[PDB]
Nucleic acid binder design. Structure first.
Lengths: 716, 735, 92, 249
RNA sequence: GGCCUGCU
RNA sequence: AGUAGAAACAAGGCC
């Protein structure tokens, strides 16, 4: 039958009908009479629509061939011959522009004169039944319907026929051409009734070929095919198989509970080796401040001018000389770098306006100090294979180092009060609710407690230094840059003040990965002689740069004044995390506020004021040789803030591992102290897990010592 | 006196101050170089936990595979992957018996979803291993490349737009003699059957960064695109199953997890009378993923899909069949340094099979020597067990089956147990009349776990009396206690854009106040610090200050120009009006009545060249990877302002041989923008159909010109011009 | 579509002949004994036959006609109808 | 006119012509998401790192013809170098602030009508009345509650057709909404937003947010009302309760 | 010396 | 040298 559509109809219509065939997903080889019927429907749609044009009037202009002009409007514009999505697109667009009603089924054409749709259907059966059939299929329709049938008859409601009658003679001539051409073909044994509305399909997902063999190799050891295994599974029913293997399984497979008593836990062993060194990016306990007493705010001002003005406030400069060498570098380079920094600072002082940011010369001194041109050149393996020295990067456990007493004192003095306010908080919306007033009062109390704390000063120092370093690295990637360490505080009298700890020289910072390292050299003034705790300054070079006179009742001290100079490095991640050190304030004060709220849930009243003023209640916050010492809530605030600050400063994988594996043991010990009969399956394994995190970090070793002290004081 | 914060625990219980034990204020550990060492170590460890299995050689991939299932029962407490098929089938049968109709229903909804799912659902995924280029690429890019290759090779069933048809094409590709791929350096290369099989069965290995809570780094894996559809269907089934199990806690959030934990502890302890003792085990499973054999997941799913259409069973079984034969790419490689000659070199991992061992240290030398037998075409066969939690939900199903297997109806003894399982972590409440009963119950639970290939970490687990325990960093002590140290890293600028960062910060403060019991004063301090960091990050200072920045001049002139300066946004250098009462209001709407009409109009102008919206999914959704958890998405309330710009892209593609991808990106985006202008609903609802672009665009041009004349700007001259231009593009597409 | 031509034969030079084809667009082609197909007329006319020959059709008889006048010896050919017919011999 | 003209210009060049011809409508989404840009793992780090560069943001090409290349002192506002995989150009953040002080102005009166949810929140809070804070232990129990206070009792898919018919009336397709509540919602949001020119996508997104019901599990103590849950952070705490009555009541 | 890139 | 820690940075590539 398909030979007929090969022969007669034009290409355009046959591929339109083929795409309509693909539309609903049925195959053309099984039933083709539908293809012919609907392609004839589509053909009558065209032949009825084309050759029919309109101009600004009604009364369509009919031309056998559209002449070249702007007057190519089509009388009837076709609906079908398009995908369902576009057919409904045209339906909705016509409804929204023509203000007509939206039909629920697919029309075939639209006309302007009568401003409505045409649903053309030419069926094998006579018209006077198919018409009202499709009419009762369509609900309350104003779209006019018109149908032909092979006998040659026409019909329509309203007795309406919308265009010329010679066109309809055309239609029925086409119709009988179709008819008495099948006459030569002979199809009416099924042509009248060949489609009955079949819609059914079964989804087929068959495993075959290579993928089947893979299925045959992904079974238990004693199975040969997926078919057999699935049959076995379907036939499988529970018949007490877990019990049999449990009985047969060796009894050494057990989870015996070892009781956890007061005498069970042993102190954590600390590693032994050379004392632990300093790792901070700046001096914390041995910092010195040169000040100007200016009225500018933290960010307000220009760095270089402030630094120069602060440094001019000090008199007593001496020619620098080596006091304590780096022990691994070239100290003369550090000396020359310091003198170069001074010289270029003067050079800025001379000229017209202090630059906002200064670049330094790339001398051999800072070329060595900043580690320039030291990365091995990257080459290909095929060119370097016979080199005996060629091997992997050194990948082994870090060097072992024992704890020293300097970190303990540094933390002790990091929780001490100061003679300045190191936090100038921002603005918030004016409090409107009583709860907001309570929150503001609490916040004011904590700010009064923690602002005068060395932890806040360290927070500001780190934030400013890391912000400046990151910005300089991102801006001046190539050229070495000078950045004075600046921090602005407010005195007890209320006068604002600036403080200059020293200088940082940032080097080449072409940082691609988050782990890539930018090297800088840090110089900081101090008065602490490095000849008393040399092991804490393994990586520092310390010079003697001047003498300071601070008013004291013992005449006047006239102390020496040294310069701690070192080469340090950071990374994008480290800079970003060090510039978010202000969340240590959060951590600490959230803990304290949780304490206050928990206690106030007992007594139905806010308990902040008496906690902060009466200072009756105290918490164990340290141990003295006499015994455990307790301090007021403010001291707890400062201690927790210092702990968070040191966590942010000495952060490392060792800290995370020890924290987790020691929180586990802390929970076990707490369960013991709560009389909850705690038990363990392998306590030695937990101890070994904790002890492997303690390698060389001073902070984690101090935490381990604190944990041992807590165990000793606990378990009683 | 020496200060010691830990001594604070002598007065404050450990859980009431547990936040102090979370050093989440410093930089988390990161990996620096290759992850090849970790990948090799994981492969060797997975293969040696199942050493007593039986060896075979796949006839298709030619790789050695180790099957430990039904192997000898363990005789020691060391990790073992010798799961027994009959035991696990019985466990699943008991799970079904205790929850009748679970499998049949879940299979019904899964069948509905599979037969109505679309291909585009695969684009909604993070990095995936594209085999066309042998590298990780965004899910959409890899899917597009694979579809292009399939269409070039003759597999065009995916044009039906159905994920099931895409999988049919994927499987049909397995039986092809020779496929063709494209490489740029364009060159057409031919892949034989075995090479393509291994490229479709392989995984890409990387090192996990920003992982807090352990000293050593780990390795993670990413699968290809051929196997992700089957994984999607299997995980849909597993999620539908677990949603019907109250003992599971994987498909829920954190608060639901806490609620279920509280309910189970109350149920276990309350029902226990005075005579029965109760004990809670806070258990962690050692080597959870390395001991879960994909064959056992195949067994579980084929038991689940019993009495179901065979096509459903086949499509759900394809995934574990491929995992059982999965291969893993070793990784980036190894970098060597020579200090004598002062140079460095980078050898790819694919050379580990043949490269001499003189360059490697003892540990790496031994690892390579042990893993070499499993090396096939630069990748190692990893049949014995899963790599990194790809089947999280099925593992949770197995754990829930174990938990339910002790409902006192199967124990047949006075002791019994229950609890909650979330993959790699569990809380087990066991009750028994005497300590001997508790010991026997825990021993039998451990033994049954060892029969299913699941191991309990004795070093990271402990048992106490009920009332105090831990679960996924949630510490329960007669009621869950807030931590607030897990969410600390999320208190900074997110890094999306100005308005997005502001809204996300305020919303995070609000949420942590609601859930994590953040205090009022602490919340105010957090708001102040966040505002300070926000102003210092975006160079948007109050405007009345003299802080010179790269943006302080325009901000200051805008400040001096504005009359009601209280309406200026913090992004434009205005005062901050936020407070505890205003944390749930966008900044634009909070300052709407205070803005000057000129500034208000300039700010919220639709014609601004900065705002760009791509799809309904990416309107106000921000992907923030939370600390100590999987990547998560958040809805943030924000008004589309001129500050909603999107930041610069990487721009490093220009120096790579894969430079033509940018031209293809530009052309695809131009075509997509044209289509959207032709089809405005393209973004909100993704268009569907089987036609091609130009057909729809030209035909809609026809119709829209028509109707927009029937009322609108068009004129006959223009309408006819459009009609004949449509004809022109038609004849152009002809040729 | 089958086609049957009628109306060919032997004719005088300067004579007239009416071809008809009983059986869409139609035409007439011719084939002389020493050549392939030559276009005649269709329903347009070739230069060798224009003004002499007229093509017409009846769509109610289903017949295309070629009215040939002032015939030349050069018109001697088998005239085929096409929509191909078998052709009718015209000899002038 | 224009649209078909850039269509023809695209089809003029062979590569785009092939892309338009061979690519089917269904693959629309795929190729639209086809990109070499990886999703950032650490957005904060790079946002703090990119903002220190010049020209850190991106904007459409049109910015080159609305904003001058430099400001009064000569600080550059935009660059002509396009982004990696787009025709957009990289520009400095000042071009934002500049746009807010001398850029074109419009009538933003209809934004309150569009962003109905946020402005309703603001109005509800502005007329709220606070009360005394009572300090007592709060038994926070976890419950499933609806957060959206303006949901019109419609699901995502249920209101998606409404949203399309309100914004994209022609792409609705087969669906014609039956429920009369949807009829009235369509009428109201059609006549209200008849000429709003913000964007079809944002209008659709905000209509989805407003009408679609959404639910989440939260620890609550008292309240349980939609209006009382949006301020759950302000009314309920660990040991304090703040009586509050939104402006709606 | 000149120019390109900074998660590809 | 320095940062850092089971492998890396201490710029890369292209002419």
């Amino acid at each position: 039958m398909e030979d007929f559509v090969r022969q007669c109809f034009n290409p355009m219509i046959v591929e339109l009908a083929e795409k309509a065939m693909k539309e609903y997903g049925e195959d053309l080889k099984i039933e083709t009479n539908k293809f012919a019927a609907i392609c004839t429907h589509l053909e009558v749609c065209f032949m009825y629509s084309d050759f029919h044009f309109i101009n600004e009037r009604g009364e369509s202009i009919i031309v056998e061939s559209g002449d070249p002009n702007a007057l190519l409007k089509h009388r009837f514009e076709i609906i079908e011959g398009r995908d369902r999505t576009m057919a409904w697109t045209v339906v909705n667009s016509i409804c929204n522009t023509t203000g007509a009603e939206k039909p629920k089924f697919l029309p075939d054409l639209y006309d302007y004169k009568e401003n409505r749709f045409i649903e053309i259907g030419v069926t094998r059966r006579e018209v006077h039944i198919y018409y009202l059939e499709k009419a009762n299929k369509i609900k309350s329709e104003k779209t006019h319907i018109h149908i032909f049938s092979f006998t040659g008859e026409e019909m329509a409601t309203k007795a309406d026929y919308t265009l010329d009658e010679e066109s309809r003679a055309r239609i029925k001539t086409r119709l009988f051409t179709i008819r008495q051409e099948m006459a030569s073909r002979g199809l009416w044994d099924s042509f009248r009734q060949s489609e009955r509305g079949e819609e059914t399909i079964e989804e087929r997902f068959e495993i075959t070929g290579t993928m089947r063999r893979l299925a045959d190799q992904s079974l238990p050891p004693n199975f040969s095919s997926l078919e057999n295994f699935r049959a076995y599974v379907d036939g499988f029913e529970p018949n007490g198989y877990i019990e049999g293997k449990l009985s047969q399984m060796s009894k050494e497979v057990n989870a015996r509970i070892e009781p956890f008593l007061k005498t069970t836990p042993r102190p954590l062993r600390l590693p032994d080796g050379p004392p632990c060194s300093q790792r901070s990016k700046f001096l914390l306990m041995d910092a010195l401040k040169l000040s100007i007493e200016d009225p500018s705010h933290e960010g307000e001002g220009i760095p270089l001018y402030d630094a120069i003005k602060c440094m001019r406030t000090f008199f007593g400069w001496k020619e620098p000389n080596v006091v304590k060498p780096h022990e691994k570098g070239i100290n003369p380079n550090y000396l020359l770098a310091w003198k170069q920094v001074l010289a270029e600072l003067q050079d800025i002082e001379n000229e017209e306006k202090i630059p906002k940011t200064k670049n330094m010369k790339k001398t051999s001194q800072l070329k060595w100090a900043l580690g320039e041109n030291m990365a091995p050149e990257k080459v290909d393996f095929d060119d370097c294979k016979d080199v005996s020295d060629l091997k992997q990067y050194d990948s082994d456990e870090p060097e072992l180092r024992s704890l020293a007493s300097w970190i303990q004192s540094e933390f002790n003095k990091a929780c001490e009060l100061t003679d300045s306010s190191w936090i100038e908080l921002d603005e918030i919306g004016e409090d409107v609710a009583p709860i907001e007033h309570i929150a503001s009062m609490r916040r004011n109390y904590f700010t009064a407690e923690v602002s005068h704390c060395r932890a806040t000063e360290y927070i500001m120092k780190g934030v400013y230094i890391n912000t400046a370093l990151l910005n300089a690295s991102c801006a001046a990637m190539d050229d070495f840059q000078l950045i004075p360490m600046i921090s602005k505080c407010r005195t007890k009298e209320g006068r604002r003040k600036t403080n200059l700890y020293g200088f940082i020289i940032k080097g080449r910072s072409h940082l691609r990965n988050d782990t890539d390292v930018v090297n800088f050299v840090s110089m900081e003034f101090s008065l602490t002689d490095p000849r008393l705790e040399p092991h804490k300054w393994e990586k520092y070079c310390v010079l003697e740069i001047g003498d300071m006179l601070l008013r004291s009742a013992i005449g006047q001290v006239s102390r020496p004044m040294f310069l701690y100079v070192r080469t340090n490095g950071t990374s994008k991640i480290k800079m970003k995390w060090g510039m978010e050190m202000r969340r240590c304030l959060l951590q600490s004060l959230q803990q304290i506020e949780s304490m206050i709220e928990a206690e106030s849930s007992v007594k139905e009243k806010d308990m902040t004021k008496e906690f902060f003023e009466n200072k009756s209640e105290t918490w164990p916050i340290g141990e003295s040789p006499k015994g455990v010492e307790e301090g007021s809530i403010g001291k707890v605030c400062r201690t927790l803030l210092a702990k968070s600050v040191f966590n942010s400063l000495y952060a490392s994988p060792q800290l995370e591992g020890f924290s987790a594996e020691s929180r586990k043991l802390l929970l076990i010990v707490q369960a013991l102290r709560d009389n909850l009969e705690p038990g363990t399956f392998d306590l030695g394994g937990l101890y070994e897990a904790i002890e492997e995190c303690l390698i060389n970090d001073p902070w984690v070793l101090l935490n381990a010592s604190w944990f041992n002290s807590f165990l000793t004081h606990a378990l009683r | 006196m020496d200060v010691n914060p830990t001594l604070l625990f002598l007065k404050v219980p450990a859980q009431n101050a547990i936040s102090t034990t979370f050093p989440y204020t410093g930089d988390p550990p990161y990996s620096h170089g290759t992850g090849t060492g970790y990948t090799m170590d994981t492969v060797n460890r997975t293969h040696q936990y199942s050493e007593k299995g039986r060896w075979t050689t796949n006839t298709e991939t030619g790789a050695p595979q180790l099957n430990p299932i039904d192997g000898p029962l363990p005789e020691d407490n060391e990790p073992s992957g010798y799961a027994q098929t009959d035991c696990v089938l019985e466990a699943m049968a008991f799970l079904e018996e205790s929850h009748p109709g679970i499998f049949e229903n879940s299979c019904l909804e899964t069948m509905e979803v599979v037969q109505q799912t679309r291909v585009d659902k695969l684009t909604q995924g993070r990095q995936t291993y594209d085999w066309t280029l042998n590298r990780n690429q965004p899910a959409a890019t890899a899917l597009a490349n694979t579809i292009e290759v399939f269409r070039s090779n003759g597999l065009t069933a995916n044009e039906s737009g159905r994920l099931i048809d895409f999988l049919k094409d994927v499987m049909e590709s397995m039986d092809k003699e020779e496929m063709e791929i494209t490489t740029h350096f364009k060159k057409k290369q031919r892949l034989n059957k075995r090479s393509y099989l291994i490229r479709a069965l392989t995984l890409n290995t990387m090192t996990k960064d920003a992982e807090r809570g352990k000293l050593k780094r780990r390795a993670i894996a990413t699968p290809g695109m051929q196997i992700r559809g089957f994984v999607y269907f299997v995980e849909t089934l597993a999620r539908s199953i677990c949603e019907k199990l109250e003992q599971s806690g994987l498909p829920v959030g954190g608060n639901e997890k806490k609620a279920k934990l509280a309910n189970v502890v109350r149920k276990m302890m309350t029902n226990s009378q005075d005579t029965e003792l109760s004990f809670t085990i806070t258990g962690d499973n050692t080597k959870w993923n390395e001991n879960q054999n994909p064959r056992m997941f195949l067994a579980m799913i084929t038991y689940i899909t019993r009495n179901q259409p065979e096509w459903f069973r086949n499509v759900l079984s394809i995934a574990p069949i491929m995992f059982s034969n999965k291969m893993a790419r070793l990784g980036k490689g190894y970098m060597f340094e020579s200090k004598s000659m002062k140079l460095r070199t980078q050898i790819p991992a694919e050379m580990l099979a043949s490269i001499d061992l003189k360059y490697f240290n003892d540990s790496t030398r031994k690892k390579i020597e042990k893993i070499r037998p499993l090396l096939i075409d630069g990748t190692a066969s990893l049949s014995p067990g899963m790599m990194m939690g790809m089947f999280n939900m099925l593992s949770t199903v197995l754990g829930v089956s174990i938990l339910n297997l002790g409902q006192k109806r199967y124990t047949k003894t006075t002791y019994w147990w229950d609890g909650l399982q979330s993959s790699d972590d569990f809380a087990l409440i066991v009750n028994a009349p005497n300590h001997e009963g508790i010991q026997a119950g825990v021993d039998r639970f451990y033994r049954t776990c060892k029969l299913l290939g699941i191991n309990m970490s004795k070093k990271k687990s402990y048992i106490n009396r009920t009332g105090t325990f831990e679960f996924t960093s949630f510490f329960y002590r007669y009621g869950f206690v807030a931590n607030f140290s897990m969410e600390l890293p999320s208190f900074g600028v997110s890094g999306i854009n100005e308005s997005a960062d502001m809204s996300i910060g305020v919303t995070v403060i609000k949420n942590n106040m609601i859930n994590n019991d953040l205090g009022p004063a602490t919340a105010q301090m957090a708001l102040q610090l966040f505002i300070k960091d926000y102003r210092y990050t975006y160079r948007c200072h109050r405007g009345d200050t003299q802080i010179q920045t790269r943006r302080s001049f325009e901000i200051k002139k805008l400040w001096e120009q504005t009359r009601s300066k209280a309406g200026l946004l913090v992004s434009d250098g205005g005062p901050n009006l936020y407070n505890i009462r205003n944390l749930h209001i966008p900044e634009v709407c909070l300052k709407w009545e205070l803005m000057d009409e000129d500034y208000q109009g300039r700010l919220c102008n639709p014609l601004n060249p900065f705002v760009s919206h791509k799809e309904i999914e990416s309107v106000n959704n921000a992907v923030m990877m939370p600390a100590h958890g999987p990547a998560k998405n958040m809805e943030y309330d924000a008004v589309a302002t001129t500050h909603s710009w999107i930041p610069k892209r990487n721009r490093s593609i220009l120096n790579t041989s894969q430079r033509g991808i940018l031209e293809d990106e530009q052309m695809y985006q131009k075509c997509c923008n044209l289509f959207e202008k032709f089809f405005p609903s393209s973004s909100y609802r993704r268009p569907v159909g089987i036609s091609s672009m130009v057909e729809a665009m030209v035909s809609r041009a026809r119709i829209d010109a028509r109707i927009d004349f029937e009322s609108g700007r068009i004129k006959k001259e223009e309408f006819a011009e459009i009609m004949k231009i449509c004809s022109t593009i038609e004849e152009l597409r002809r040729q | 579509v089958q086609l049957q031509e009628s109306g060919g034969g032997l004719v005088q030079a300067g004579g007239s002949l009416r071809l008809s084809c009983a059986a869409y667009v139609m035409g007439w082609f011719r084939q002389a004994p020493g050549k392939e197909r030559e276009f005649v007329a269709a329903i347009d006319y070739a230069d060798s036959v224009k003004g002499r020959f007229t093509i017409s059709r009846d769509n109610a008889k289903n017949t295309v006609y070629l009215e040939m006048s002032s015939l030349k010896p050069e018109d001697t050919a088998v005239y085929v109808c096409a929509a191909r017919g078998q052709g009718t011999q015209v000899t002038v | 006119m224009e649209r078909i003209k850039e269509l023809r210009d695209l089809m003029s060049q062979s590569r785009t012509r092939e892309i338009l011809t061979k690519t089917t409508v269904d693959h629309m989404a795929i190729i639209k998401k086809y990109t070499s840009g990886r999703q950032e793992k650490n957005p904060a780090l790079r946002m703090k790192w990119m903002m220190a560069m010049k020209y850190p943001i991106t904007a459409d090409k049109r910015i080159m013809e609305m904003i001058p290349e430099r400001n009064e002192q000569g600080q550059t506002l935009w660059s002509k170098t396009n982004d990696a995989g787009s025709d957009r150009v990289m520009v400095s953040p000042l071009a934002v602030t500049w746009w807010n002080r001398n850029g074109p102005t419009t009538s933003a009166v209809h934004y309150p009508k569009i962003y109905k949810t946020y402005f309703e929140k603001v109005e509800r809070l502005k007329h709220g009345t606070f009360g005394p804070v009572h300090f007592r232990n709060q038994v926070k129990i976890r419950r499933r509650v609806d957060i959206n206070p303006g949901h019109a009792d419609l699901s995502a898919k249920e209101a998606q057709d409404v949203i399309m018919e309100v914004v994209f009336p022609n792409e609705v397709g087969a669906r014609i909404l039956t429920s009369e509540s949807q009829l009235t919602i369509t009428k109201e949001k059609k006549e209200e937003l008849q000429d709003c020119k913000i964007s079809p996508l944002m209008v659709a997104y905000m209509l989805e947010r407003e009408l679609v019901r959404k639910t989440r599990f939260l620890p609550v103590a008292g309240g349980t009302s939609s209006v009382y849950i949006e301020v759950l952070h302000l009314t309920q705490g660990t040991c304090w309760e703040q009586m509050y009555t939104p402006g709606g009541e």
